C-alpha cells in the first residue's frame with residue numbers, strides 16, 4: 001500500500017521512505033550535491049560490488065550486488081583489482097549504523113543512484129530495494145582489469161550476468177565521469193575525458209582520437225597513449241592530463257563492440273538511456289527481482305543534460321580520428337577553437353583547489 005514521505009514524495013511502498021533520509025545524509029555528509037571525486041568513486045564501487053558473481057562457479061564465488069565490499073572491508077577492497085576502492089568503501093561504512101534498516105547491498109546501489117543524479121546528463125536510474133543484509137566475501141579474480149582484452153572482458157560480463165556486448169559498452173559510458181588515481185603511481189585524478197564532471201558522450205569521441213603521448217609515465221599496465229596528455233602537474237598544478245585505458249581503446253576498435261562504441265558519439269539521450277538499462281541490470285546481480293521492491297521514486301531527479309553539443313576538444317579534429325565502424329558514418333561535429341590544449345579542470349567549478357570528504361575506515365589501499 002501507498003504512502004507519502006517526509007519530503008512529500010509519493011511511494012508505492014512505505015518502506016521506500018527510509019531511503020529519503022539516507023539520500024539526504026549521503027548528500028550532506030559525502031557527495032555534497034556534486035558530481036565530484038566522492039560521487040565518482042561511489043559509482044565505481046557499485047560495479048566492484050555487483051560484478052563479483054559467477055554463473056559458472058556458482059553462488060559460493062560471490063553474491064553480486066550484496067554489499068560484500070562493505071560487510072567484509074578487509075577482504076575484497078584489498079585484492080589488487082580493487083586497489084583504491086577503499087575510499088568509497090570507508091565513506092559508506094558509517095551509513096550502515098546510521099541507517100540500520102537498510103542493508104549494505106541496498107546502501108551501495110542507492111548511493112550510486114544518488115551519486116549519478118549529481119551529474120549533468122545522467123539518467124534517473126531504477127532502484128529496487130530488499131537485498132538481504134548478510135552475505136560473504138567474494139573470491140579474487142572476478143573484476144576486469146584495464147589490461148584485459150575484449151574476449152576476456154566480454155566473457156567476464158557474460159559470466160557475471162549475461163551482459164551482451166552492447167550492454168558492456170553501455171556500462172562503460174560511466175567513464176564519461178571517470179578519472180584514475182592508481183593506474184599511474186605518479187598521477188592523481190587523471191581524467192578519461194575532457195568533461196569528467198559531465199555525463200556526456202565526450203569519452204566515446206575522445207577514445208577514437210589518435211594517441212600522441214602520456215600524461216605521466218609511458219609504461220603503466222593497462223594504459224595506452226592519450227590524444228590530450230598535457231596538464232599542469234609538472235609545475236605543481238592539479239589539472240592532470242587526459243589518460244586512456246587499454247580496455248577502452250580495445251572496446252572502441254574490436255569488431256564486436258566498435259559500432260556500439262561509436263554509436264554513442266553525439267547521441268546523449270541514446271547513451272544515457274542505454275547506460276540506465278544496463279546499469280539497472282548490474283544493480284540487481286545476485287538477486288531475483290521478484291524478491292525486491294520498486295523504490296525508484298526516491299531516486300533524486302538528476303541535473304539536466306548540459307546545453308553544449310558534442311565537439312572536438314581544442315587542437316583536435318576529425319582528421320585525428322581512428323575509425324573502425326563501417327555501419328554508421330561518424331557525424332560532422334564542431335571543433336573547439338584554440339591553438340593549445342585546454343587544461344582539464346581538477347574540480348567541477350573549474351578551479352584546482354576543491355577538497356573531498358573522506359572518512360577514516362578499515363579498508364586500505366596500496367601505492
Ligand code: HEM
Pocket residue numbers: 037040041043044047084144145146147153171172174175177178179180181182183184222245247279
Ligand atoms: C572492462 C570493464 C572496466 C574496466 C577495465 C575499468 C577500469 C577502470 C580503472 C582502471 C579505473 C581507474 C581506477 C583508479 O586508478 O583510480 C576506473 C575508474 C572508474 N570506473 Fe571503470 N572499469 C570498467 C567498468 C566500469 C563500470 C561497469 C563502471 C560503472 C557502471 C565503472 C565506473 C567507474 C567510475 C565512475 C570510475 C572513476 C572513479 C573516480 O573517478 O574516482 N567502470 N575504471
Ligand SMILES: [Ca+2]
Pocket residue numbers: 048049050051052062063064065066067068069138
Ligand atoms: Ca559484492
Ligand SMILES: [Ca+2]
Pocket residue numbers: 175176177193194195196197198199200201202203
Ligand atoms: Ca564527460
Ligand SMILES: [Mn+2]
Pocket residue numbers: 084087181
Ligand atoms: Mn584514493
Ligand SMILES: [Mn+2]
Pocket residue numbers: 037040041179180181189
Ligand atoms: Mn578516484
